[PDB]
Every structure is written in C-alpha cells, then in structure tokens.
Amino acid sequence: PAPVTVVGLGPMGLVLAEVLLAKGHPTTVWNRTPERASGLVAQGASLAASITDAVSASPVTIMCLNNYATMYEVFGPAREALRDRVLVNLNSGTPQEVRAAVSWASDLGTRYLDGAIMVPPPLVGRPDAVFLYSGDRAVLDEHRATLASLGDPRFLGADPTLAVLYNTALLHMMYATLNGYLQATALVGSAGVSATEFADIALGWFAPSVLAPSSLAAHAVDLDKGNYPGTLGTLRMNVNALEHIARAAEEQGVHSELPHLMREVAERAVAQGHGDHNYMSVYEAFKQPS
Amino acid sequence: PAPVTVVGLGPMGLVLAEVLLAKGHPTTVWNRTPERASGLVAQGASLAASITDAVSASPVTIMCLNNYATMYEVFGPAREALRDRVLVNLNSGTPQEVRAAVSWASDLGTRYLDGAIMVPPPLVGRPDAVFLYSGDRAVLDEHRATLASLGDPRFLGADPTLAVLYNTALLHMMYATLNGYLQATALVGSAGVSATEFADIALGWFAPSVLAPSSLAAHAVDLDKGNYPGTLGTLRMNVNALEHIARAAEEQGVHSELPHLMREVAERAVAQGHGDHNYMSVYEAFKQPS
Ligand SMILES: NC(=O)C1=CN([C@@H]2O[C@H](COP(=O)(O)OP(=O)(O)OC[C@H]3O[C@@H](n4cnc5c(N)ncnc54)[C@H](OP(=O)(O)O)[C@@H]3O)[C@@H](O)[C@H]2O)C=CC1
Ligand SMILES: NC(=O)C1=CN([C@@H]2O[C@H](COP(=O)(O)OP(=O)(O)OC[C@H]3O[C@@H](n4cnc5c(N)ncnc54)[C@H](OP(=O)(O)O)[C@@H]3O)[C@@H](O)[C@H]2O)C=CC1
Ligand code: NA
Ligand code: NA
C-alpha cells in the first residue's frame, strides 16, 4: 500500500485518513488546526509540520477542505511541491469551481483528479461507498489501489466537472424524494394518521406502482426530444391537484411553501404552452434560470 | 346496472358519466351550464331539468364539482330530496371541507360517502384506476357495483377525511419525486449530459439503492417517535450539500428556487436543535406551519 497524504481533517478528512491508515498506507496528514490529528497520530499517522512537507511526503495528496477557495490559500506555499505530484480533490462543489481548480493545477504542472464522495463520513471505507471521479483517467488507473481503500471508485469520463455535478444532481433527487415523503407524512399526521399507517398505502402500494425508477426512466428519451404527450393526463389537470395540495397543507397547519412553489412552477410551464402536455413538460420550466 | 346521477360536468364529471353510460347504467346528469351535457345526451344520458330532479332520479348521486363550497350552493334546493338518498362526493379537497360536508349531510339525513380520484379523466373506467373512499363503509358495500364501474374502489377507513387527505399526500409525493428527477436532469443537461445518459445512472443505480420504498418505510416508526440518530450522517452535513446543490443550479443557469427553499427548510430544523440528527429530522420542519 503506497504512502498517501490527506490535507484537511474535518469530519470527512479524518475518516479518509483513518481508513487509509487501517488499510496499511503510510499516511501523512495536515490540518490548519493540528490538534485534529491527535487520534490519527496515535493510530500511526505522521503529522506534517507544513503543507509543503505534507505534499512532499507522498506521491498522492488527497484534499478534503471546506470549499474550493480554501485550496488556493492552503496549497499556496506548496505550489512547487505539487509539481509532478498527484492531487485528488474530494471537495464537493460546482463545475465553475472545478474548472478554475483544473486550470490552477495545469499551470502548476500537477496531475489533478477531481472527485466527489457520495456517502457521509461514517460510511467511507465500505465496499459499497461510492466515490465519483472525472478528469484524467491515467491518475485513477495509476493510483487505483489507494482510492479503492476508500470505497468504490467510479470514473464518469474525461470532463473534470462530472463528479461534482452528478453529486449535486443525484443528491437533489434524494432530498426531493425524502422531502416529498416527509411532507406527505406530516400532512396525514395533522389528521391523526401515523407515519407507519401512511407507509402501508404510500410505500406498499403507491410508490412501487406509480414511482418505480424504470417508469421515470422511460420518460428520459422524451425529455431529450421535448416530446410530452398528454393524451392520458394533461398538465392543466395536474395544476388543479397542486392547488388542492397547497391549500390542504396551509389549512392543516403543516409546511406549505414547498407545495405552493411546486404549484407556481407547474403554472409557469402552462403559461409557456404546456397545458396539453403530460406533467413531465415541467422539465421545460426546470431548464430555465430563476 | 343501477340508475345513477352525476352532478358536475367538468372534465372529470363528463368522463364519470360517459363511463357509467358505457357500462350500461341509466345515467341522469346535471350541471350549472347545461350545454356541457350535449355529448352525454347524444350518448343516452338524461339531462335533469333541476338539481332536485337529478337527485330524485337515482338511488345514488355522485358529485364532482370544483370545490366543496360549490356543493352547498348546488344542492341547496335539493336538500329535502337528498334525505334517505346516497351522496358520493368525489371532489378533491381538504379534511376541514370534508368534516363540514359530513355534518351538513348528517343534518339532511342523507347517506354520505366521501371519495377521491387518483387518476386523470382519460384513465377512469379501467380496472386499475384507483378511487379512494372513506367514511360509511355500508354505502360502499351496497353501491359497490356502481362505483366499480368507475375503477378500483379502495376503502381506507371510517374517518371520512382519509380519501381527500391521502389524495393530496400521495400526489404530493409523486410531484416532489418527479420534480426531483426533472431538476436533476436539467442540472446535468446544463453540462451537455443527455436525459437518457443521466437516467441510466440515477434510476438504474442511485434510486434503487438509496430510495427503495421499503427503505423509506423503515424511517416511519422513528418519524412517529421523533427519533433521529445522526451517528451515520448529520443534518448539518446534508445542509452543506443542499447549499452546493442550490449554488450549482444558480451558476449553471437552471431553476434554483426549489433547491434554495429546500436548503432553507432544512436550515429551519438545524436552528431548532436538529443539526446533529439524521436528515429525517427535517420532518420536524415539515410539521411546522409556514
Ligand atoms: N461531511 C460529509 O458528509 C461530506 C462532506 N463532503 C465534502 O468534504 C469536504 C470536507 O467536509 P467536512 O469534513 O464535512 O467539513 P468542512 O466542510 O467543514 O471542512 C473542514 C475542513 O476545512 C478546513 N478549513 C476550513 N476553513 C479553512 C481555512 N480558512 N484555512 C484552512 N483550512 C480551512 C478545516 O480546518 P480546521 O479544522 O483548522 O478548521 C477542516 O480541515 C467538503 O467539501 C464537503 O462538502 C463530501 C461528501 C459528504
Ligand atoms: N381533472 C382531474 O384530473 C381530476 C380532478 N379531480 C377532482 O374532480 C373535481 C372536478 O374537477 P374537474 O372536472 O377537472 O373540473 P373543476 O374542478 O374545474 O370543476 C368543474 C365543475 O364545477 C362546476 N362549478 C364550478 N363553479 C361552480 C359554481 N359556482 N356553481 C356551480 N357549479 C360550479 C362546473 O360547472 P360549470 O360547467 O357550469 O362551470 C363543473 O361542473 C375537482 O374536485 C377535482 O379536484 C380529481 C382527480 C383528478
Ligand atoms: Na471534487
Ligand atoms: Na371527496
């Protein structure tokens, strides 16, 4: 197991280092506040005296800092140490932040690979914990054994922004679906229906029959074509149901802003000529900036 | 097939009457604007001269009006005629509207059964189109043959508010989940990723592994207890992800209001001491009025 450097000992960075150490890697760590490395040092990690020392200690530096902006401040003194070394950026963020980092890394002559972690810190190190990677495939192939110690590395393609972008898109789907479930549970709960009683109907019947992933996936080809046949249900009729949902949430005394905004966004699609189309035409409203 | 009355000839009421007619029921219809019955009359329906005549024409009256307030205005002159007759209320609405309707119906001496339609008008009449019912089960048992002509009648319980409440809750889950999928597709599409490439990843891997209905159902018992252990991931960490999602949508030029509001609502539960708890603790924010 090759030597590795971890820069950033927040909750995520601490677990990345702990796992690399447990998997046998000689691990050098660096953090602005050195006391965060106390437990790691007891486990066999080496606390670097400086960012340059940390970068020079290993062929690979894995960074996990609060934001992309922090990277420039932290790695400033280690710019020459980064030359001909590997920098794996596991920070979450946006495509604009990744493009700037890729340009900075190219100017320094460092081999850069951007990634995104799909799990919270306690799930890192498990064989099913997905880490997305995108950019220079050669970095992943050469340092595969090290990255595989953290979980399941999945390379998405040459575009370096893919990992962070897919992280935000997939996580958005998760939060929207969980919020839908929580809002519905709070709505029936306002009338004395228990969460478990509601799960019998909602998750036992409704969600498997109406919201099966393969059913949502069948709409994908039509989303790419902008084809939204409403022969079996139109957006205008869906708007009427959204109006009832929002008024119910409000009258029942549970959260009503998200229901009102969903009604408003569907109305925008109606205003732009999608009244006859199926509900998926609201994709046209999701494509437009707010 | 027994005689039936349909009151309300909007897009849904027109199809309820058309299906009852096709299934052989002698069908009497009434609407404030009588010209809506033109096609139904050509199909063999009888246009009632008045609301009293409509109610008196059949043992069962099925109503499908825009709102519950309309019911009092429409059925006012037929109040005495409604005594000892059956009124099936298929309007969508809220629990407060249903409780008031149940009280009004009890005072009139009419047998009342509230319901909710889970499909759009073109799917009515099919054996799998679900119609929810709640309240007096004896009404459903006695008039099951007529209601079964419209689709699959599903009785939820004695509480008359259940059908409308479940309609709004389940539909909210469907819209939230579809919107999550569309927002995510628009976000990756801003970087040149096609809807089909993304759907294969998000729905082929992510949704079955993270959002399986049985996994959401396992949270239900803890939602009822208010138990949200954050040992495997905290709400504060999920809020950091929600911030990147909103910033990504904004920078990418796609819809960002829904992502910003979801971040805001999760922050409200953090402000109330749920920062260290798991994501499902945002249920406490969904229970709060806006
Ligand atoms: N936690 C999670 O669930 C997940 C996190 N991520 C991502 O991992 C990254 C790290 O997250 P996490 O560990 O949770 O905690 P944070 O996002 O809060 O990052 C904390 C780290 O940033 C350092 N830091 C902050 N400000 C500065 C500064 N001005 N100068 C130097 N160092 C600074 C901290 O140092 P110090 O200790 O000295 O304050 C610490 O090492 C983030 O990009 C996050 O989005 C990805 C997936 C899941
Ligand atoms: N359409 C759908 O996809 C679904 C609809 N529903 C529910 O079915 C019900 C009917 O819906 P829908 O058919 O789509 O259309 P609407 O909700 O717009 O209701 C139209 C009906 O209401 C009548 N009406 C409106 N205002 C008055 C008034 N002041 N006095 C008398 N009658 C009035 C109309 O009469 P007039 O023609 O004279 O204007 C017409 O018969 C609603 O509760 C809806 O939520 C349920 C599931 C799906
Ligand atoms: Na990254
Ligand atoms: Na009803």
Residues 200-219 of B with CB under 8 A from A: 200-204, 206-208, 210-211, 213-214, 216-217, 219
Residues A178, A283, single domain; the answer is yes
Q: What is the distance in angstroms between the Cα of A56 and the nearest Cα belonging to chain B?
A: 31
Residues A56, A174, single domain; the answer is no
A31: its two tokens: 């953090």
CA atoms within 13 A on the CB side of B61: 31
Count of pairs with CB atoms under 8 A, one residue in A, one in B: 357
Q: At B249, which amino acid appears? A: A
Of A157, A189, A221, the position where a domain reaches its end is: A157
Tell how far CA A138 is from the center of its chain.
23
User: Which strands, in side-by-side order, build the sheet including B130-135?
Assistant: B46-47, B27-30, B4-7, B60-63, B86-89, B111-117, B130-135, B152-155
Residues B182, B218, single domain; the answer is yes
Of B97, B122, B157, the position where a domain reaches its end is: B157
Residues 257-276 of A with CB under 8 A from B: 257-262, 265-266
CB-based contact B176 A173, cutoff 8 Å: no
| Contact yes or no for B153/B133 (Cβ under 8 A) | yes
B153: its two tokens: 């009648």
Q: Using a CB cutoff of 8 Å and minimum separation of 24, what contacts does A220-225 make?
A: A220/B185, A220/B195, A220/B196, A220/B198, A220/B199, A220/B200, A220/B203, A221/B195, A221/B196, A222/A280, A223/A280, A223/A283, A223/B182, A223/B185, A223/B195, A223/B199, A224/B194, A224/B195, A224/B196
Torsions phi, psi for A34 (to 5 deg): -65, -25
Residues B255, B134, single domain; the answer is no
| Contact yes or no for B66/B133 (Cβ under 8 A) | no
Residues A201, A95, single domain; the answer is no
Helix (H) and strand (E) counts for chain A?
15, 8
Burial class (CB in 10 A: 0-12, 13-18, 19+), B16: buried
Please tell me the distance from the alpha carbon of residue B182 to that of residue A286, in angstroms, as a whole number: 7
Closest in B94, B253, B287 to A186, CB measured: B287
Burial class (CB in 10 A: 0-12, 13-18, 19+), B3: middle
Residues A141, A4, single domain; the answer is yes
Domains: count for chain B: 2
| Contact yes or no for B74/B144 (Cβ under 8 A) | no
| Interior/surface letters B247-270, b for 16+ CB within 10 angstroms, e for the rest | bbbbebebbbebbbbbbebbbebb
Cα A157–Cα A158–Cα A163 angle in degrees, nearest 5: 55
Residues B16, B91, single domain; the answer is yes
Q: B159 C-alpha to center of ligand 4: Å? A: 12
Q: Determine whether the shortest distance from the Cβ of B94 to ligand 2 is under 6 A.
A: no
Residues B169, B282, single domain; the answer is yes
Q: B221 lies in which domain range? A: 158-290
| Contact yes or no for A30/A47 (Cβ under 8 A) | yes
Residues A2, A146, single domain; the answer is yes
DSSP output for B273-285:
IITTS-GGGGHHH
End-to-end CA distance of chain A: 49
Cβ contacts of residue A75 below 8 Å, gap of 6+?
A7, A51, A55, A63, A82
Closest in B166, B191, B223 to A161, CB measured: B191
Residues B63, B178, single domain; the answer is no
Residues A6, A86, single domain; the answer is yes
Question: Nearest residue of B to residue A225 by CA position?
Answer: B195
Residues B11, B138, single domain; the answer is yes
Q: B87 C-alpha to center of ligand 2: Å? A: 16
Q: At B263, which amino acid appears? A: R
Q: B12 C-alpha to center of ligand 2: Å? A: 7
Of A128, A157, A186, the position where a domain reaches its end is: A157
- Atom number, ligand 2, closest to the C-alpha of residue B90: 8
Please tell me the distance from the alpha carbon of residue B99 to that of residue B93, in angstroms, as a whole number: 11
- Atom number, ligand 1, closest to the C-alpha of residue A73: 30
Technique that determined the structure: X-ray
Q: Determine whether the shortest distance from the Cβ of B89 to ligand 2 is under 6 A.
A: no
